[PDB]
């Protein structure tokens, strides 16, 4: 019932500002999730598919963003880097079910689309399940000024580049990550 709109969606936000959508007090099926070979990776870390038909639908979360193809391998527990230190840090605990699948024809046109953004510079790397939308200059060099973007003062975001003539590891993969909790 509830998540028929979080997979077929025509608009996925970029990674640095995702959309945590909770579902509550409504039935779920999870047979739409498995028995479909359209997905690339269907890793689940704590609980097992074809078993989670228990009383778990107390605010089941579902994050969603878009990253390049060989950075699905940083949406594992642990596994530090540059898309899991500053954008989406999973805990060393129960991540629900990290799900990813190739998308070259939906979020990428012939003109070299670069509309999706990801952070590159952030001191004091992220806690588990925390979002950072604060667009402020880095200021890692000289004395704190009002922001001039000249030298050793970088813009905190950067585009990707999603041409359809790239290989596998530079094409956008629409990653959706479930999460579960109790009371």
């Amino acid at each position: 019932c509830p998540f028929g709109e979080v997979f077929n969606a025509t608009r996925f936000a970029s990674v640095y500002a995702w959309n945590r959508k909770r579902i509550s007090n409504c039935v779920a099926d999870y047979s739409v999730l498995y028995n479909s070979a359209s997905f690339s990776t269907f890793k689940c870390y704590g609980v097992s598919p074809t078993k989670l038909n228990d009383l778990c639908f107390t605010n089941v979360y579902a994050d969603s963003f878009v990253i390049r193809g060989d950075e699905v391998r940083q949406i594992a527990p642990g596994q530090t880097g540059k898309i899991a230190d500053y954008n989406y840090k999973l805990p060393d605990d129960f991540t629900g079910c990290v799900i990813a699948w190739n998308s070259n024809n939906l979020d990428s046109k012939v003109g070299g689309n670069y509309n999706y953004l990801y952070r590159l510079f952030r001191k004091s790397n992220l806690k588990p399940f925390e979002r950072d939308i604060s667009t402020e200059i880095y200021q890692a060099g000289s004395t704190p000024c009002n922001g001039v973007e000249g030298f050793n003062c970088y813009f905190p975001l950067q585009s990707y580049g999603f041409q359809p003539t790239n290989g596998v590891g530079y094409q956008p993969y629409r990653v959706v990550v479930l999460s579960f909790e109790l009371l």
Partner: antibody
């Protein structure tokens, strides 16, 4: 805080056995897989054995097929490797390297993960087989 | 000897770009698995450098990048300095032997 310290190297005649130790601290040992890799002195690295999350899935390399035995314990956070019928080509520095975690796919069977490397490596002790 | 084949020793001048090739068979790398890369400083324990064919963990700088072109991947160092004289082993996973494979080791030095 995260490190893997070992002990247990020595001089063994070819034919008798030895137990290898690999202590663990700084992280959660009770959920992550573990890998053993060895280095011949001068030559490159080679793979030895892997142990899964719970202790039901094990694999070994090509040169150690059957004549080795791996077993761990989550309680005292210590990883063991038992050997018997040793040869003279096993004289190598033995590392224990932390693996990645593990996953259940749709079908639902735990699968050791294959696409990940070995993040943090131990200091590694040397064994010596000679006459 | 080893399952993966790579050049045993290649080097170059500082500030230039060196390609450490790492080619394998169609049973392990070409089957759909991901290469990785290590860096063994002389006399010590290696560290992870690149995993998942393009990434870099927390701590390794921006100079060490890589790729995976079909059935033969390659590591690329841009702006190399004197403090990187170590060896660089590439590894993968194999479906036939059902075990991890490694490389022959590349001796990279500065001139």
């Amino acid at each position: 805080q995260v490190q893997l310290v070992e002990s247990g190297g020595g001089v063994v005649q070819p034919g008798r056995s030895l137990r290898l130790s690999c202590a663990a601290s700084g992280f959660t040992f009770s959920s992550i897989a573990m890998h053993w890799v060895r280095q011949a002195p001068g030559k490159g690295l080679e793979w030895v054995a892997v142990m899964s999350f719970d202790g039901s899935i094990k694999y070994y390399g090509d040169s150690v097929k059957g004549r080795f035995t791996i077993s761990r314990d989550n309680s005292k956070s210590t990883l063991y490797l038992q050997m018997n019928s040793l040869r003279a080509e096993d004289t190598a520095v033995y590392y224990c390297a932390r693996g990645v975690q593990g996953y259940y796919d749709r079908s639902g069977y735990y699968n050791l993960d294959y696409n990940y490397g070995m993040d943090v490596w131990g200091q590694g002790t040397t064994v010596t087989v000679s006459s | 000897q080893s399952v993966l084949t790579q050049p045993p020793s290649v080097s170059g001048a500082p500030g230039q770009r060196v390609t450490i090739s790492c080619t394998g068979s169609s049973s392990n790398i070409g089957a759909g698995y991901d290469v990785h890369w290590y860096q063994q400083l002389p006399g010590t324990a290696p560290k992870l450098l690149i995993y998942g064919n393009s990434n870099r963990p927390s701590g390794v700088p921006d100079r060490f990048s890589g790729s995976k072109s079909g059935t033969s991947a390659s590591l690329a160092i841009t702006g190399l300095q004197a403090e990187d004289e170590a060896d660089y082993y590439c590894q993968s996973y194999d479906s036939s032997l059902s075990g991890w494979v490694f490389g022959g080791g590349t001796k990279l030095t500065v001139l």
